[PDB]
Design an enzyme around this catalytic site. Sequence first.
Site, PDB file in Angstrom:
ATOM      1  N   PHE A 279       0.801  -1.230   0.000  1.00  0.00           N
ATOM      2  CA  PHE A 279       0.000   0.000   0.000  1.00  0.00           C
ATOM      3  C   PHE A 279       0.823   1.264   0.000  1.00  0.00           C
ATOM      4  O   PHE A 279       0.293   2.346  -0.289  1.00  0.00           O
ATOM      5  CB  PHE A 279      -0.900   0.099   1.259  1.00  0.00           C
ATOM      6  N   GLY A 280       2.064   1.166   0.422  1.00  0.00           N
ATOM      7  CA  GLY A 280       2.815   2.361   0.828  1.00  0.00           C
ATOM      8  C   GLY A 280       3.738   2.063   1.973  1.00  0.00           C
ATOM      9  O   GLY A 280       4.224   0.928   2.108  1.00  0.00           O
ATOM     10  N   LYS A 281       4.004   3.065   2.818  1.00  0.00           N
ATOM     11  CA  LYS A 281       4.928   2.842   3.910  1.00  0.00           C
ATOM     12  C   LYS A 281       4.384   3.428   5.203  1.00  0.00           C
ATOM     13  O   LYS A 281       3.385   4.172   5.214  1.00  0.00           O
ATOM     14  CB  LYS A 281       6.328   3.372   3.562  1.00  0.00           C
ATOM     15  N   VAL A 282       5.005   3.029   6.289  1.00  0.00           N
ATOM     16  CA  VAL A 282       4.691   3.551   7.614  1.00  0.00           C
ATOM     17  C   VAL A 282       5.977   4.202   8.142  1.00  0.00           C
ATOM     18  O   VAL A 282       6.996   3.551   8.209  1.00  0.00           O
ATOM     19  CB  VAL A 282       4.233   2.473   8.593  1.00  0.00           C
TER      20      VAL A 282
ATOM     21  N   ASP B 283     -11.066  -8.273   7.466  1.00  0.00           N
ATOM     22  CA  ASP B 283      -9.648  -8.586   7.162  1.00  0.00           C
ATOM     23  C   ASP B 283      -8.768  -8.689   8.406  1.00  0.00           C
ATOM     24  O   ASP B 283      -7.631  -8.175   8.456  1.00  0.00           O
ATOM     25  CB  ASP B 283      -9.123  -7.558   6.202  1.00  0.00           C
TER      26      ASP B 283
HETATM   27  C1  LIG Z   1      -0.354   2.061  10.082  1.00  0.00           C
HETATM   28  N1  LIG Z   1      -0.354   0.745  10.681  1.00  0.00           N
HETATM   29  C2  LIG Z   1      -1.013  -0.311   9.862  1.00  0.00           C
HETATM   30  C3  LIG Z   1      -0.580  -0.338   8.425  1.00  0.00           C
HETATM   31  C4  LIG Z   1      -1.003  -1.614   7.709  1.00  0.00           C
HETATM   32  N2  LIG Z   1      -0.364  -2.791   8.290  1.00  0.00           N
HETATM   33  C5  LIG Z   1      -1.212  -3.638   9.130  1.00  0.00           C
HETATM   34  C6  LIG Z   1       0.948  -3.006   8.075  1.00  0.00           C
HETATM   35  O1  LIG Z   1       1.613  -2.266   7.346  1.00  0.00           O
HETATM   36  C7  LIG Z   1       1.613  -4.161   8.808  1.00  0.00           C
HETATM   37  O2  LIG Z   1       3.026  -3.944   8.917  1.00  0.00           O
HETATM   38  C8  LIG Z   1       3.448  -2.855   9.655  1.00  0.00           C
HETATM   39  C9  LIG Z   1       2.599  -2.104  10.463  1.00  0.00           C
HETATM   40  C10 LIG Z   1       3.083  -0.978  11.121  1.00  0.00           C
HETATM   41  C11 LIG Z   1       4.420  -0.635  11.010  1.00  0.00           C
HETATM   42  C12 LIG Z   1       5.282  -1.407  10.256  1.00  0.00           C
HETATM   43  C13 LIG Z   1       4.798  -2.487   9.536  1.00  0.00           C
HETATM   44  O3  LIG Z   1       5.534  -3.140   8.575  1.00  0.00           O
HETATM   45  C14 LIG Z   1       6.146  -4.378   8.964  1.00  0.00           C
HETATM   46  C15 LIG Z   1       7.310  -4.074   9.891  1.00  0.00           C
HETATM   47  C16 LIG Z   1       8.610  -4.830   9.732  1.00  0.00           C
HETATM   48  O4  LIG Z   1       8.759  -5.549   8.522  1.00  0.00           O
HETATM   49  C17 LIG Z   1       8.025  -4.912   7.489  1.00  0.00           C
HETATM   50  C18 LIG Z   1       6.568  -5.179   7.749  1.00  0.00           C
HETATM   51  N3  LIG Z   1       2.153  -0.242  11.859  1.00  0.00           N
HETATM   52  C19 LIG Z   1       2.297   0.558  12.957  1.00  0.00           C
HETATM   53  N4  LIG Z   1       3.504   0.600  13.577  1.00  0.00           N
HETATM   54  C20 LIG Z   1       3.560   1.438  14.625  1.00  0.00           C
HETATM   55  N5  LIG Z   1       2.608   2.250  15.094  1.00  0.00           N
HETATM   56  C21 LIG Z   1       1.442   2.181  14.447  1.00  0.00           C
HETATM   57  N6  LIG Z   1       0.297   2.860  14.724  1.00  0.00           N
HETATM   58  C22 LIG Z   1      -0.685   2.442  13.860  1.00  0.00           C
HETATM   59  C23 LIG Z   1      -0.191   1.492  13.011  1.00  0.00           C
HETATM   60  C24 LIG Z   1       1.173   1.328  13.360  1.00  0.00           C
HETATM   61  C25 LIG Z   1      -1.000   0.781  11.990  1.00  0.00           C
END
Ligand SMILES: CN1CCCN(C)C(=O)COc2cc(ccc2O[C@@H]2C=COCC2)Nc2ncnc3[nH]cc(c23)C1
Length: 351
Positions: A34-37, A150
Amino acid sequence: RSVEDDKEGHLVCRIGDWLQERYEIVGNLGEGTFGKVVECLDHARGKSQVALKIIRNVGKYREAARLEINVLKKIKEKDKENKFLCVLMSDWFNFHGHMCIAFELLGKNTFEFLKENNFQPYPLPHVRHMAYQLCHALRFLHENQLTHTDLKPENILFVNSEFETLYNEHKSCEEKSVKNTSIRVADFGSATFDHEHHTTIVATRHYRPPEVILELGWAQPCDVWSIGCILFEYYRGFTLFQTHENREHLVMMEKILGPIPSHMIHRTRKQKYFYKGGLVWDENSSDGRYVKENCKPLKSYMLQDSLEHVQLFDLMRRMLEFDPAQRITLAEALLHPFFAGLTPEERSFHT
Ligand SMILES: CN1CCCN(C)C(=O)COc2cc(ccc2O[C@@H]2C=COCC2)Nc2ncnc3[nH]cc(c23)C1
């Protein structure tokens, strides 16, 4: 500096850059389809910690993010006090075509944690607390005419994933044990209200229920099936249905859970899966031999005999009922004797 996108439409993000003259990027948390966090500090709210979801500059992903923002607005209206363990947005904006959604900063997701522990499972007390929170969170959505559709380990996040390193009693190796098992449910982009259009197929395949495969329609019970799968995965550290294809998946369901009820077979238009009222499949194929070798009755996966394990499995069996009308609801699940084991601090949400 120009705004730059890579060949897949991801925003090129630089530590030190600001967005909306407000969010300072301080870390990259991960990248997905989808993009990045990215981790930011919010300079308009006292340098508060934010996770910003930054969506690819791709029309279909932009449209999907706009849908997620609208779902997130509705959820907040229903839970103004933020009491039901959902990850709600603090802001959103369109940054040169990239939809960005700001969230509270959390720890590792429950899949990432499991993977970083070399797929060694969570202990039962952890599973129980995580189960309780999931049932609580989703019960609230379900009572407000919403279905997530999901749910999976990667969409469930620890509030704080700091851990202790312990020597595994019974194996020749180290184990990571989370210090606090408080979790929150995220990723509402596919979440669908009762009155809204329901697509034929929902859920990630491994967490997808039989009514969806058989195209019988779906509602809130979809999520309960997913929860059953998740809890199995937490408890064993491997996927319940490690499958890539519908016919295979059904066969796995039959091997693990018993026969598909005949009333569901009679209703489905997906008669290609059946012959003479039973599943039809090739026992000699790669998939057939895999399932025959690897898929056993659910109870055979219990690690111990004691009461709390027996109760987890009773609850899981009820979550994995074929007939979604017969399947346990989350309101009932919260009354299950499995949850007698919770500490008072776990039960009262003072973790
Ligand atoms: C926005 N957040 C859901 C997005 C959608 N989703 C579920 C993912 O992308 C799952 O994977 C990650 C979630 C993530 C951060 C990193 C991720 O990436 C993995 C990490 C290591 O190896 C790569 C794969 N979320 C978060 N982290 C910290 N704080 C957060 N607050 C809210 C979210 C989030 C949800």
